[PDB]
Design an enzyme around this catalytic site. Structure first.
Site, mmCIF file in Angstrom:
data_model
loop_
_atom_site.group_PDB
_atom_site.id
_atom_site.type_symbol
_atom_site.label_atom_id
_atom_site.label_comp_id
_atom_site.label_asym_id
_atom_site.label_seq_id
_atom_site.Cartn_x
_atom_site.Cartn_y
_atom_site.Cartn_z
ATOM 1 N N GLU A 152 0.939 -1.208 -0.085
ATOM 2 C CA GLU A 152 -0.133 0.320 -0.316
ATOM 3 C C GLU A 152 0.616 1.224 -0.019
ATOM 4 O O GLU A 152 0.268 1.777 0.675
ATOM 5 C CB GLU A 152 -1.001 -0.136 1.000
ATOM 6 N N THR A 186 -1.131 3.851 -7.526
ATOM 7 C CA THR A 186 -1.155 5.577 -7.872
ATOM 8 C C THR A 186 -1.065 6.266 -8.887
ATOM 9 O O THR A 186 -0.781 6.794 -9.814
ATOM 10 C CB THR A 186 -1.623 5.659 -5.965
ATOM 11 N N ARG A 244 -8.905 2.670 -3.650
ATOM 12 C CA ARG A 244 -7.670 1.455 -3.307
ATOM 13 C C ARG A 244 -8.095 0.075 -4.192
ATOM 14 O O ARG A 244 -8.895 -0.088 -3.613
ATOM 15 C CB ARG A 244 -6.907 1.603 -1.952
ATOM 16 N N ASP A 266 4.121 -2.199 -12.656
ATOM 17 C CA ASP A 266 3.452 -2.176 -11.606
ATOM 18 C C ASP A 266 3.454 -3.467 -11.240
ATOM 19 O O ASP A 266 3.134 -4.178 -12.225
ATOM 20 C CB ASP A 266 1.794 -1.215 -11.790
ATOM 21 N N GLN A 295 3.189 -7.033 -1.345
ATOM 22 C CA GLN A 295 2.489 -7.129 -0.293
ATOM 23 C C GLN A 295 3.970 -8.581 -0.734
ATOM 24 O O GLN A 295 4.378 -9.352 -0.374
ATOM 25 C CB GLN A 295 0.919 -8.408 0.002
HETATM 26 N N1 LIG Z 1 -3.377 11.358 1.138
HETATM 27 C C1 LIG Z 1 -2.468 10.368 -0.345
HETATM 28 N N2 LIG Z 1 -2.714 8.325 0.104
HETATM 29 C C2 LIG Z 1 -2.063 8.453 -1.131
HETATM 30 C C3 LIG Z 1 -1.289 8.775 -1.938
HETATM 31 N N3 LIG Z 1 -0.637 7.815 -2.105
HETATM 32 C C4 LIG Z 1 -0.821 6.614 -2.428
HETATM 33 N N4 LIG Z 1 -2.225 6.729 -1.168
HETATM 34 C C5 LIG Z 1 -3.399 6.039 -1.133
HETATM 35 O O1 LIG Z 1 -2.661 4.912 -0.742
HETATM 36 C C6 LIG Z 1 -3.938 3.886 -0.624
HETATM 37 C C7 LIG Z 1 -3.215 2.862 -1.872
HETATM 38 O O2 LIG Z 1 -2.565 3.030 -3.306
HETATM 39 P P1 LIG Z 1 -2.291 1.920 -4.212
HETATM 40 O O3 LIG Z 1 -1.587 2.376 -5.317
HETATM 41 O O4 LIG Z 1 -2.919 0.681 -4.326
HETATM 42 O O5 LIG Z 1 -0.800 1.006 -3.323
HETATM 43 P P2 LIG Z 1 -0.299 0.303 -4.291
HETATM 44 O O6 LIG Z 1 1.394 -0.395 -4.100
HETATM 45 O O7 LIG Z 1 -1.180 -0.538 -4.936
HETATM 46 O O8 LIG Z 1 -1.103 -1.255 -3.380
HETATM 47 P P3 LIG Z 1 -0.111 -3.096 -3.230
HETATM 48 O O9 LIG Z 1 0.149 -2.765 -5.086
HETATM 49 O O10 LIG Z 1 0.810 -2.716 -2.663
HETATM 50 S S1 LIG Z 1 -1.323 -4.362 -2.661
HETATM 51 C C8 LIG Z 1 -4.093 3.970 -1.987
HETATM 52 O O11 LIG Z 1 -6.044 4.625 -1.240
HETATM 53 C C9 LIG Z 1 -4.298 5.828 -2.290
HETATM 54 O O12 LIG Z 1 -5.296 6.662 -2.541
HETATM 55 C C10 LIG Z 1 -0.488 10.302 -2.213
HETATM 56 O O13 LIG Z 1 0.302 10.117 -2.520
HETATM 57 N N5 LIG Z 1 -1.443 10.892 -0.304
HETATM 58 MG MG LIG Z 2 -0.314 -1.992 -6.274
#
Ligand SMILES: Nc1nc2c(ncn2[C@@H]2O[C@H](COP(=O)(O)OP(=O)(O)OP(O)(O)=S)[C@@H](O)[C@H]2O)c(=O)[nH]1
Ligand SMILES: [Mg+2]
Lengths: 841, 341
Positions: B23, B28, B152, B174, B178
């Site tokens: 996460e 994103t 998310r 991407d 986890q």
């Molecule tokens: N406020 C804020 N929220 C963020 C920011 N970057 C990511 N998020 C939040 O974090 C959450 C996870 O983002 P995501 O892109 O899904 O992580 P991920 O790496 O893909 O998750 P995973 O792939 O490791 S399972 C989302 O709800 C997103 O809105 C940010 O820069 N600012």
């Molecule tokens: Mg991801």
């Protein structure tokens, strides 16, 4: 030897013939110019001169006709001997009628110089004979020129012309020997490199299919050419869809191989797999490999084939027919079961020792199990085959006895040594010219002029420093300090070599011009003497053959003739006319002669360079094909197979391990681009195991092959000699240490793997086994036996990250101090219940 | 032959592998790149994020170890309705659930449980989406671009995105992050141009979903130590984003959690001299973010041998302008990185 150095002059003949033609033309041209001289200028009161000149011109054109005969090609030395005796006698007979006070010493001596040069350089006579003809001609010319100082001066002049004669002689013929020798080397290497290229081709085709081998023989990637000589190792895989995989297993191989003497077995198995290879090349199915009693093909993996399913089951029915013919013929109670599956396959090469074209997928594992679920005599096919088989066969329901699966049943001469030798001779003739010019003073006890002795000392010290430079460069004393000599050796390139060669050629004519400041044209002995000596010095400008032609020839024309055009006018009346004629003929001779010798030197360097290129190229091809041969078979089998036709051997004690990565299947996942990246990871692990083979304490451990994820290696095979400093069963100890260290290698590999671990189990056993080679024009080293099958049982019944050992290997390993614990009691097919042991505690 | 041109355009691209722990914001960043340089289930998993958040808070009311109780105890039937739908395959989201969610999010024992969200696993878009589903109670509204960035969705498996900025090709991977997905990373390690390591900076006070006993930022540090020292990455430089700057800023300015409570070397830490903060910034936040940056730069310093570098930037992925600036800077950087071969 003898027929070597006779074939030398057989292939050095036509340049000798061309040289002899040029000498004939030059002697005729000399007779022509002396004819027009004595017919226009002087001696127009008597015809005794010009008629021998005209008759010898027509004798020379008679010899130019005689060159073209076919009874010359072995007669050329004797024809040259006849010509040079005629020219000796004619020059003595055209000198003989002088000293009436009409003709000089400076003309007859030019004839002497010319004829000694044509003897030494072009006539091509042996050394002893041309030398004694030269000395005999010189002494008879001085004793017929006579009809306490000047005579020995002329003898000094003949001394230095014989010096430059013998020098040009020996260096011309050592170059003609050595260029012949280098072209002999470069023509042996062409044929021998064709042989090594054929052997390399035969070893490429024995491990890879035709398409990819013919890719590999036009060298499409140069990086493989650089590598056979940074993050991932290179590997070649192509995830190819729609192939059709066939396995096949000999039923009852153990009782069929019951009491064979391990030479009958390899022979019958050679026959059987040769019949299968004939089936493959008929059916256009690529075979992949052969392991144990099992044979397996694909159907168009490198080539997209449209009837790949048809080709596969037709090859299976061909196998059924071939094994029933073998059963009738050799009277052996065997048959074989076949599984055929289609699907997608990523096919390539992994490992780096013993590598071989294989296939890997899950479709291959499915084909393996449908062979394992097959019934003997019948080919066991899947839905994936049958969905486009078009059902033109005797199909059945392939039902198990315990997934839309069916059955089908039917229907010298060193380039810096020559420079030493000609610097030596240039300074020794500069020496004796200086001596001859000094000893002219029979009127003064002490030498009058200052500039003569000044230039004498100056170029004397310059020659002795260049001599010491060259002679300590070769003889290599390392006496005082050489870093100035090392950086002074550097700066004499091609053009500084030209300029130091200019001075080191020129300076004897400077020593003879050094005596012109005192007046000489009063006396006529002094005038003719300095003319004779200056032509003796201009004819000395031949020796630096490592220079260019036009450079030395034009410097010769300048600093041997230009000052005498200057001293033409200094009044000396008609001797100027004959001296400009005499320097004309001498300069034309020296132009042609040093031209032809530097052409010879240029061709010698050319024949050295090309015959070193072919030597490095055959060293490369021999090293490359020897690496492939030590790849595809071991060494002692290569020794016993070079002297013979086939190989088989029965070893009475040898150990063997298999080594299976257990959890690779839960790392495989095909969701990305077929999962070939996962096999790059697996290639890295097999490459680390192969790096264990390059250790000098893992010399006598052989790698048989790798089978999917499994790694098979065996010992005791190379040790033919019972050593005095070693143990009779020590190869088991070093093989067990090999197993321990490949456990260590996977532990080191998992540190670079993040949040996953590979685990491998190995199984160890020794006993007597059976080495062999299967193909011919293909090759495959393999072992069989019961030791091998109990070792594969110790593998598959293993616990991961622990070594499992059989009973007799426990009994011999635990007498070398290792620790084990009793695992349990395991059913072995043929041995029944068996006592196993484990190495970690 | 046709493979020389394709081989050289394969040389021409830039392979931007995105690593990072759970996460941290990889997907994103990829969504942000396709906003920069390039249709109905997005509404559904926005609503899934809503329902996931509100049921997490409702369960975590009683599932705090001092139980934060309802400041308005009249909504116990609503709490039981939310706990009723907690584990269900499908949910049509009736207007009853919208009124239940709004009536829960106005309560202050609910919000008082929400403020203790470092003690239990909760998704990083709850505060935004409770208000926004109160706006999109209906279904005939198309979500905005920020609404698309905040949704998310978990990532499992290697995804790709090819985009082209000013005749330069970018091809980025991407990946999920986890602990179960980490075995799949090594498939992408062949001839990768750069690694954009992504770190959730504001999650210094939270723990990971796998074992619930390891700090998220400590997990990201050990993951960075692993991929930095990897035997197939020892010639490949690592751009290091540090995501979620604004959440870090407000969690410092709230002052409830201290970094030295969790990383006790922070108390004796001083801001560096070459610190170039943004305008209008409490410098204790600057001390925080340069502390975290130098925590990673210790790892990138203690080895490396001049072979591969590390270029830390500060970034907030849900704000497009920040991503524009830092990706222009990274564009110049990886131009230099691809010209290293
Ligand atoms: N406020 C804020 N929220 C963020 C920011 N970057 C990511 N998020 C939040 O974090 C959450 C996870 O983002 P995501 O892109 O899904 O992580 P991920 O790496 O893909 O998750 P995973 O792939 O490791 S399972 C989302 O709800 C997103 O809105 C940010 O820069 N600012
Ligand atoms: Mg991801």
């Amino acid at each position: 030897s003898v027929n070597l150095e006779e074939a030398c002059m057989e292939r050095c003949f036509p340049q000798t013939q061309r040289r002899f033609r040029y000498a004939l033309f030059y002697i005729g041209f000399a007779c022509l110019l002396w004819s027009i001289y004595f017919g226009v200028h002087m001696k127009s009161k008597l015809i005794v001169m010009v008629a021998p000149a005209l008759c010898f011109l027509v004798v020379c054109v008679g010899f130019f006709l005689f060159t073209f005969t076919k009874l010359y090609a072995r007669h050329y030395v004797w024809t040259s001997l006849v010509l040079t005796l005629l020219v000796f006698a004619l020059t003595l007979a055209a000198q003989f009628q002088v000293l009436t006070p009409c003709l000089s010493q400076v003309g007859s001596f030019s004839m002497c110089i010319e004829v000694l040069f044509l003897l030494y350089t072009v006539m091509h006579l042996p050394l002893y004979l041309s030398l004694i003809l030269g000395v005999a001609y010189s002494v008879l010319f001085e004793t017929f020129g006579y009809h306490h100082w000047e005579l020995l001066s002329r003898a000094l002049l003949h001394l230095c012309i014989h010096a430059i004669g013998i020098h040009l002689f020996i260096m011309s013929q050592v170059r003609s020997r050595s260029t012949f020798l280098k072209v002999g080397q470069s023509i042996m290497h062409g044929k021998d490199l064709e042989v090594e290229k054929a052997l390399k081709e035969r070893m490429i085709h024995s491990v890879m299919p035709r398409i990819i081998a013919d890719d590999l023989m036009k060298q499409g990637d140069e990086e493989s050419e650089n590598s056979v000589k940074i993050a991932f190792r290179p590997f070649k895989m192509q995830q190819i869809e729609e192939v059709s995989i066939l396995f096949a297993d000999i039923v009852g191989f153990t009782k069929m191989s019951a009491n064979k003497s391990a030479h009958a077995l390899v022979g019958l198995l050679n026959d059987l797999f040769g019949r299968f290879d004939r089936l493959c090349e008929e059916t256009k199915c690529e075979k992949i490999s052969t392991l144990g009693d099992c044979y397996y093909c694909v159907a168009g993996c490198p080539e997209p084939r449209a009837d790949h399913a048809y080709c596969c089951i037709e090859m299976g029915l061909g196998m059924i027919r071939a094994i029933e013919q073998f059963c009738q013929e050799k009277k052996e109670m065997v048959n074989m079961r076949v599984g055929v599956h289609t699907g997608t396959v990523l096919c390539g090469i992994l490992g780096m020792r013993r590598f071989k074209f294989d296939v890997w997928s899950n479709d291959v594992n499915l084909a393996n199990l449908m062979e394992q679920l097959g019934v003997a005599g019948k080919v066991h096919i899947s839905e994936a085959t049958a969905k486009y088989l078009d059902d033109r066969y005797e199909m059945e329901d392939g039902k198990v006895t315990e997934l839309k699966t069916y059955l089908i049943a039917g229907q010298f001469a060193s380039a810096t040594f020559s420079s030493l030798l000609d610097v030596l001779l240039s300074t020794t003739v500069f020496l004796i010219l200086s001596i001859t010019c000094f000893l002219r003073y029979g009127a003064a006890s002490t030498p009058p002029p200052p500039a003569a002795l000044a230039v004498f000392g100056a170029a004397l010290l310059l020659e002795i420093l260049s001599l010491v430079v060259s002679v300590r460069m070769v003889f290599f004393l390392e006496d005082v300090m050489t870093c100035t000599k090392r950086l002074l050796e550097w700066i004499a390139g091609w053009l500084p070599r030209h300029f130091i060669g200019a001075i080191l050629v020129s300076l004897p004519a400077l020593a003879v011009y050094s005596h012109v400041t005192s007046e000489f044209e009063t006396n006529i002995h002094s005038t003719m003497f300095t003319g004779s000596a200056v032509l003796t010095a201009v004819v000395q400008y031949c020796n630096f053959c490592q220079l260019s032609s036009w450079m030395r020839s034009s410097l010769a024309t300048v600093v041997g003739a230009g000052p005498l055009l200057l001293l033409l006018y200094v009044s000396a009346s008609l001797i100027g006319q004959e001296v400009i004629l005499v320097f004309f003929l001498l300069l034309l001779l020296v132009w042609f002669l040093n031209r032809e010798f530097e052409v010879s030197y240029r061709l010698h360097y050319h024949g050295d360079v090309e015959a070193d290129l072919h030597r490095t190229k055959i060293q490369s091809m021999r090293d490359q094909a020897d690496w492939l041969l030590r790849n595809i078979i071991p060494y002692h089998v290569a020794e016993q197979l070079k002297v013979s036709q086939t190989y088989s051997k029965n070893h009475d004690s040898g150990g063997v391990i298999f080594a299976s990565i257990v959890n690779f299947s839960e790392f495989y996942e095909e969701n990305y681009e077929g999962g070939k990246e996962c096999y790059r990871v697996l290639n890295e692990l097999i490459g680390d195991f192969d790096e264990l083979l390059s250790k000098p304490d893992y010399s006598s451990i052989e790698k048989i092959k790798t089978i999917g994820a499994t790694y098979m290696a065996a010992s005791g095979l190379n040790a033919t000699q019972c050593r005095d400093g070693s143990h009779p069963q020590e190869h088991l100890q070093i093989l067990f240490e090999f197993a321990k260290e490949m456990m260590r290698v996977v532990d080191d590999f998992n540190n670079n793997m993040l949040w996953f671990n590979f685990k491998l189990r190995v199984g160890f056993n020794h006993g007597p086994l059976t080495a062999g080679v299967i193909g011919t024009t293909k090759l495959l080293y393999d072992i069989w036996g019961d030791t091998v099958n109990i070792a594969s049982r110790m593998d598959t019944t293993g616990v991961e990250c622990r070594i499992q050992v059989s009973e007799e290997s426990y009994r011999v390993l635990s007498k070398m101090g290792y620790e084990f614990d009793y695992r349990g009691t395991v059913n072995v097919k043929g041995k029944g219940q068996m006592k196993t042991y484990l190495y970690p505690k | 032959k046709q493979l020389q041109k394709d081989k050289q355009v394969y040389r021409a691209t830039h392979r931007l592998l995105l690593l990072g722990a759970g996460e941290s914001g990889k997907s994103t960043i990829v969504k942000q790149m396709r906003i920069l340089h390039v249709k109905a289930t997005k509404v559904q998993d926005i609503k899934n994020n809503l329902k996931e958040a509100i049921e997490t808070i409702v369960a975590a009311m009683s599932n705090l170890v001092p139980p934060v109780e309802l400041a308005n105890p009249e909504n116990q039937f609503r709490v039981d309705y939310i706990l009723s739908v907690m584990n269900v395959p499908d949910f049509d989201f009736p207007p009853e659930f919208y009124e239940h969610a709004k009536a829960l999010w106005e309560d202050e024992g609910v919000r008082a449980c929400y403020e203790r969200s470092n003690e239990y696993q909760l998704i990083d878009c709850a505060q935004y989406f409770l208000d926004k589903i109160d706006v999109i109670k209906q279904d005939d509204y198309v979500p905005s671009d920020q609404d698309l960035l905040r949704c998310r969705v978990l990532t499992s498996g290697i995804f790709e995105t090819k985009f082209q900025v000013d005749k330069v090709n970018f091809h980025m991977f991407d990946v999920g992050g986890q602990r179960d997905e980490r075995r799949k990373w090594i498939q992408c390690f062949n001839d990768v141009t750069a690694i954009i390591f992504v770190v959730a900076s504001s999650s210094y006070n939270m723990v990971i979903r796998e074992d619930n006993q390891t700090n998220r930022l400590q997990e990201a540090l050990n993951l960075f130590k692993s991929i930095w020292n990897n035997r197939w990455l020892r010639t490949i430089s690592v751009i290091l984003f540090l995501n979620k700057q604004d959440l870090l800023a407000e969690k410092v300015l709230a002052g409830k959690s201290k970094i030295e409570d969790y990383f006790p070397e922070f108390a004796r830490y001083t801001t560096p001299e070459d610190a170039t903060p943004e305008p209008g910034e409490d410098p204790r936040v600057t001390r925080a973010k340069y502390f975290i940056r130098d925590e990673f730069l210790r790892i990138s310093t203690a080895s490396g041998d001049g072979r591969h570098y590390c270029y830390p930037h500060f970034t907030c992925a849900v704000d497009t302008e920040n991503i524009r600036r830092v990706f222009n800077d990274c564009r110049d950087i990886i131009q230099r990185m691809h010209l290293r071969q």
